[PDB]
Copies of this chain bind each other. A is one copy, B any other.
């Protein structure tokens, strides 16, 4: 038992990180086969990013303006292409440490691991969720751009995020590995707002199930409720509406605990309406919404990868 925010093992991604320099700007890139991916604003300078014309900027730029280093070793760039908000640099050496991999665009409420990197070197790894408003609550300093977020499916790495920016509220925004932002963000230094965040209801439920599984059951009450009625209370607290797809996704946890989703919902309604009363659930004094059902299933079944 016990319950921790767990990240995937980062070994397979660590071998893919490199440093990309264009003039004085340095950030991280991702080296897969003979291609390096990084944010296109590597080609901008720190003090003129208010509203870049990326096309014009990129036009002063040749293959040789791009310094790519993997550890000590410099790579030769033989080709460059802009794709949405990402630059792709063709290099002359396939990464010998390339994992099996794909590129996926994740959905709001899914989780993934971030390998936070500086100057192309790994600093740390943590787990994050794509919020409903397509931000993440990461931990990212200057130099972190180009750090990636991923999942591991057995031996396969699914890359889903590349870091680009921090928004005024101190949350973070970025793209998929095709260069397309999650959310309405753009890669210029301008005031940009995320909308209202909402709680990922299905995640909160999974976490309530994990609680039960771990023996923490104080909050289970003696009521049940309806989807419709639950959803009336959900909406008022800025919880995402629960659908029957959510109910069915929780099926394993439901089955494993013997507690029907709508019972667990009733418990949740009371926690929403009366707060925790200074108690904790799995050591937390707030309702956690950054574990998917899938996450909970695996931390309570021991899923492995390498």
Residues of A bordering B, CB below 8 Å: 1-12, 14-15, 115-119, 121-126, 128, 137-144, 166, 170-172, 214-215, 275, 278, 280, 283-286, 298-306
Contacts and interface: CB of A to CB of B under 8 A. Distances in A.
A268 B171 CA distance: 26
Nearest to A2: B139
A6 B121 contact: no
A153 to B, nearest CB: 13
Nearest to A117: B304
Q: How many copies of this chain does the complex contain?
A: 2
A3 B128 CA distance: 12
A124 B280 contact: no
Contact of A8 (B124, B141, B166): B124
B171 A125 contact: no
Given A11-B14, A117-B304, A283-B137, A298 B123 contact: yes
A7 B124 contact: yes
A174 to B, nearest CB: 13
Contacts of A305: 121-123
A6 B137 CA distance: 13
A297 to B, nearest CB: 12
Nearest to A124: B6
